[PDB]
Design an enzyme around this catalytic site. Sequence first.
Site, PDB file in Angstrom:
ATOM      1  N   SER A 131       0.854  -1.171   0.000  1.00 34.38           N
ATOM      2  CA  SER A 131       0.000   0.000   0.000  1.00 34.38           C
ATOM      3  C   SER A 131       0.893   1.224   0.000  1.00 34.38           C
ATOM      4  O   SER A 131       2.033   1.168   0.463  1.00 34.38           O
ATOM      5  CB  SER A 131      -0.920   0.023   1.213  1.00 34.38           C
ATOM      6  OG  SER A 131      -1.656   1.224   1.244  1.00 34.38           O
ATOM      7  N   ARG A 132       0.379   2.332  -0.521  1.00 38.68           N
ATOM      8  CA  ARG A 132       1.207   3.526  -0.621  1.00 38.68           C
ATOM      9  C   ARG A 132       1.109   4.429   0.599  1.00 38.68           C
ATOM     10  O   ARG A 132       2.141   4.843   1.132  1.00 38.68           O
ATOM     11  CB  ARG A 132       0.862   4.324  -1.883  1.00 38.68           C
ATOM     12  CG  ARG A 132       1.278   3.634  -3.182  1.00 38.68           C
ATOM     13  CD  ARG A 132       1.127   4.558  -4.389  1.00 38.68           C
ATOM     14  NE  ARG A 132       1.487   3.904  -5.652  1.00 38.68           N
ATOM     15  CZ  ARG A 132       1.503   4.507  -6.840  1.00 38.68           C
ATOM     16  NH1 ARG A 132       1.221   5.797  -6.938  1.00 38.68           N
ATOM     17  NH2 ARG A 132       1.841   3.833  -7.931  1.00 38.68           N
ATOM     18  N   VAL A 133      -0.095   4.744   1.067  1.00 38.04           N
ATOM     19  CA  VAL A 133      -0.238   5.690   2.169  1.00 38.04           C
ATOM     20  C   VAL A 133      -0.900   5.032   3.367  1.00 38.04           C
ATOM     21  O   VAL A 133      -1.430   5.717   4.248  1.00 38.04           O
ATOM     22  CB  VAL A 133      -1.030   6.934   1.732  1.00 38.04           C
ATOM     23  CG1 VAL A 133      -0.253   7.701   0.687  1.00 38.04           C
ATOM     24  CG2 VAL A 133      -2.391   6.535   1.194  1.00 38.04           C
TER      25      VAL A 133
END
Lengths: 55, 505, 85, 473, 239, 120
Positions: free
Chosen positions: B370-372
């Site tokens: 996941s990025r954030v």
Amino acid sequence: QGYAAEISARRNAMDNASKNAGDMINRYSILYNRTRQAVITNELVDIITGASSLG
Amino acid sequence: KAQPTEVSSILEERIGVSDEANLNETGRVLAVGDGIARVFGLNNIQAEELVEFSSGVKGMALNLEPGQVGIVLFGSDRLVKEGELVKRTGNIVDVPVGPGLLGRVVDALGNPIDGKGPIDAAGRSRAQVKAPGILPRRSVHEPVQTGLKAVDALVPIGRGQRELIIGDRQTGKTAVALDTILNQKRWNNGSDESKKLYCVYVAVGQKRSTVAQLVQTLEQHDAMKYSIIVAATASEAAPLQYLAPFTAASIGEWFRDNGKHALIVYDDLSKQAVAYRQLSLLLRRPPGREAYPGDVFYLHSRLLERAAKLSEKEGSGSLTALPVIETQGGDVSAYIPTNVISITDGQIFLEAELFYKGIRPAINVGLSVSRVGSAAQVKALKQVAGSLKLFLAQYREVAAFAQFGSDLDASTKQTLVRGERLTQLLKQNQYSPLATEEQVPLIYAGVNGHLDGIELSRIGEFESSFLSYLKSNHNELLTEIREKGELSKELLASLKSATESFVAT
Amino acid sequence: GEWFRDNGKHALIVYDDLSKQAVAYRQLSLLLRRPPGREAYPGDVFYLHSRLLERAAKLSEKEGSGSLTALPVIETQGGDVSAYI
Amino acid sequence: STPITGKVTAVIGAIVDVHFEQSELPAILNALEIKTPQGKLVLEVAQHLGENTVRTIAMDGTEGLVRGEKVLDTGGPISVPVGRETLGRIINVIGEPIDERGPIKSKLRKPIHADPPSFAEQSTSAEILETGIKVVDLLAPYARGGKIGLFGGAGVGKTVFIQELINNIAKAHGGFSVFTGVGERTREGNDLYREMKETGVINLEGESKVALVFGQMNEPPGARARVALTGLTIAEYFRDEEGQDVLLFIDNIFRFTQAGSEVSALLGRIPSAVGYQPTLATDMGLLQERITTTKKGSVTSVQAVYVPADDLTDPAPATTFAHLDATTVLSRGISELGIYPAVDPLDSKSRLLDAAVVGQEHYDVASKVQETLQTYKSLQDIIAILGMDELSEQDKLTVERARKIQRFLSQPFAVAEVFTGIPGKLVRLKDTVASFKAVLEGKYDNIPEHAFYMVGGIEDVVAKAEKLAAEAN
Amino acid sequence: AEYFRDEEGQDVLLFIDNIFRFTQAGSEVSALLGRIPSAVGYQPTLATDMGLLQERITTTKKGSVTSVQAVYVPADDLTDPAPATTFAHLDATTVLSRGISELGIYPAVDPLDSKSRLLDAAVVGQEHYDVASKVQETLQTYKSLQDIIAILGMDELSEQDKLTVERARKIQRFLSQPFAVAEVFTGIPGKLVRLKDTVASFKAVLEGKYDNIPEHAFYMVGGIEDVVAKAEKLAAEAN
Amino acid sequence: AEYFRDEEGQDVLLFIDNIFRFTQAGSEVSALLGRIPSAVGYQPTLATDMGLLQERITTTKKGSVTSVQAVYVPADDLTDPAPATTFAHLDATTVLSRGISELGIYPAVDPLDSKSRLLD
Ligand SMILES: Nc1ncnc2c1ncn2[C@@H]1O[C@H](COP(=O)(O)OP(=O)(O)OP(=O)(O)O)[C@@H](O)[C@H]1O
């Protein structure tokens, strides 16, 4: 003794080679199937596009 | 009884509409073949307006011409006959939204198929609503506790973080979001609405038996009181399957714009792409890569952009999206997924071989990210899982390295043993979500090498054993993790003692 | 061959080939502006050969037990069976 | 009463166009008749082209046709006769008997394009269809009203397997069988029909337990894209009228997919991926969702799947696999070992092989069986290389156990009674669970491996053990 | 941008993301604009619209425009006409491979396929050119030997080839660099590594002064002094 | 060639290159003749035009024609139909190969695929 050790490690290496070759066959078969499907689809595109610009 | 005839006779009174039935729309149908229909007339029709044919089937007028208008069907063409009368609704395609939608099971148009009478709708909302601009947004800062082990451990999800679940056929994909919805029972039984989180599952192109068993299962665990099911099964028309996720997105926007928090799950966008290229090829439009029209990126784009975290100016609503992509043989280079990967905020890859090894969930950590999510992970989990992804990538490095049978030093063999324990740790049966207070001590035991002396097969009973141990005894620490979501040093040492106690067995 | 077959006799036929015949039917259909399919072939080309090869059979004693037997020839390309024809 | 006379305007291969008189247009998917000198010719309205003129596809050969002939409309779709009269009759896609046993005097006739049952009518939990065969009921259990992908080429007793299935359903549940050969080789269809007469599932005078529909290969694609729906409607009748569990057997779904793609090609639609039709998912879903478990009963469908050029990312098996709940693989290697049936234990998998489905005990039994046979197959290299010397008492026990199971998977066939002489056994589920469980515990390790080949159950295990002990004494 | 280049005469940083989306927008409407579909599915007016876009992105005598454009690659096919057309307009290519990122190498720049109209020995200095030349030779040698590594492994090499593969795999992990932006993915502070130190670092690696240091100490590192520090940490911790 | 065979009664050698340019140029215009494009990018009238060109090249009882036709193979693909049709018209097939030319050996003939009908 080193003769039997050589043939042992050689048998091990050929086993590893058969394993790696099977894995790489399993990759390139999937690459082959995607390539074949893409080729048939892409040439069918040009078949349709010629039939698209009719009178 | 006769009370259905009473309600239907009040609807017969509405059927008052005949006294004001001067429709400025009616026109003859020129032709109607291959899932499309050319209609003459309708000279005050609107673009993407809902119309209804004389055989009751509705349709969307999609392309307007001088001379005719091409209207797509919303069903089989067997009902529509040439030369008939095509009344327009007067509306761009809208769907019922409201709280009474919870529990019900509807079509793509909000018409319920559960047989539970009408829909208590709080309004009607358009399908192709604009996604909100960059200003009424906020970066995600609130967790989505899925209940799964490695999901909540490694790929945390923000309220509104658009996270892809990608996998292959029969690879445990549906069960992930299913058990996430089942975890949401914790707060949907609760009272704080900002803790609550509402679930919309969108089954498109699938088997009606499968959807029936899913709805049955959600009634068994009683998720239905916060669930909304949108059915666009494979028997139904391709435009219905095209249209339904936009409608459910409008439902999620209804919940989000009320300040509330809501979860939508798409399953699957892959068949929606099939339906959409079926439309476009029957629109005689030219395809592109893999016989898809080039706007199919824009399609799932304009779908998934209507899901984010609203700012406090908007009431701090959120809408989190879980798309599902079925690939072909673990390929991540087909045209459809590579588009979705360019849209979503991260990936959850399910390897077919891990589930073929029975490891359920079959999470490939090395691909899934996941990025954030780290900005909205649970703070205790953020404390206790910092070395965890590092150690699992480390064990993955010596995973393929240890296949040669060569003996190694105590460091790499130590990482090998502990990573085997962590790998066999993160299995989890279906319908078994785990709270965060439950997930913390397993991580704390897995980091600190206590599992290493335990047998590899013993880990599964050890998990439930140590959980029932703590629930029996260190229930105060469970409440501390529940209340804080954050471990102090005193909680850390008390946790250490409480672990090492049962680690002595 | 069906003439012999309905005489209670035995006939072997050898088609050689069918690939050129499929190419010829493809040419006829494409110049007749019928919509092409995979590798520009018509749709009914399978319907072609299925209407052909089922004409060879082995008849009943009620009929007289005639027999037509077919040996078609398929020129493959590059040793491929995945090709459409 | 009202003859809707149409006129032929365009004949292009299998594509027929008819101009009608005004306000007389039939809807899409309606049967249209043309009185030929050779019988009747059937058409199927698929595209209203406007101008009182529609486009149909053929259902037989279109030779010698004059444009402008009288076209008779039937109003509704293709009516096919249903009922007890249909058992043991060879029926075309039209609904006509072609076994030359006279006309079918069925009471009802049903349209073939019925709707699928509603979401409310779906039975919300798939139980296990008890077949009767040990391996199927053990490893890949069939959903009552489910989808079964049968693999494997001919020559493995696949027809023998499916006739044994017919008899096991007839004895066990009493529901009937509807076989549907879409694109079936007409010679092989004849040999099938002759065998089904000879094995007794077709009784020409008594009660044939099965209805046959053979869309032959020489029929235009308009036929072969509807033969499946014909057999579907016939099975739907025996479900929804008689309240039974009726088994629909389809070969081939891939030839059906070819038929649908060719129909979409002849209608001038733009082809999609792989050369398949663009309506592929919808053409599948119109076939699949009409096969389900009602509250009246169920239709369980077994259908063969040809894998096209050995590819699984091909969208026709990739579409079919989005519906199959259980797979069954008739390998050659199992038939190579003289095992009837030829079921591979390892590949034939179900989505209903679950402890919350079959109970915990059946799940654990099948789990240990799959683990034991998996370890056995892994050992099969060094079994031939090194021998039983490398087997520990952990190992040679499991090797012996898997040999005992591998013989014990073999079942006598009620259809191979004119073949082998040994009568088949309708082996029940609860006998099978306990039998494999007692083998998995090791209570018959003293019994030789040979006392398990082609047996019914654990009572037959004890009986054959005593008989072979007496014959050895 | 070109207003400030012309009216103001300044230095303009133009960041474009994503330039492929432009050509895709040119593709989606062209079927509805009555055009015959061109190659693959793109529009016929691809290279012209690409040219009219790129030729306004330039550096005049009036001002200086330094532009950076992300290029999406459709399904990792560099033979797609849009990025292949885009290669004609660029001075400094930088290609990201997914397979390099799958080795955790961040950034996942392909060391071979990146090019520049720069990197001349009379421009970057002779020594810089020589070091980069030897690095590309070493990595090309490794990529050539990759298939034999896949079948046989490092044991069936010659020792010069084995040393070359060892040094190249040290170099690959040395290429990865901690980012201040992706610190939330790493927990590691970013490394703003100077040019001359990088040149001397790769110089000493090509000279093989650190062949004693294992490969993992090269991974996700700053300068060569940081490789020394990480090797010290691995020596003190792994022991 | 037909004149010096039949109207002359004499052995005639014939050297045609390139035969592939014939079919190629037919394909080059057949799209603009309003023909639907066939397979591979060739014209539909491939086998008929190839047949009518090849069958006028024969040895009759009136006279002998010895035909030598150099044929282009696009990108060394024999499964390309425009080379693959030509095999049906030829007795003495003689095949060059680029991989054999990579050994530098001349004439770089495949000793395998260069078959004959006279090899009795
Ligand atoms: N944690 C788990 N516990 C038990 N069973 C599981 C678990 N995870 C997956 N499964 C099994 O995996 C199978 C597939 O489930 P699921 O439908 O989620 O896979 P899928 O890839 O989504 O398939 P489809 O895409 O066809 O729905 C189910 O039969 C289920 O029993």
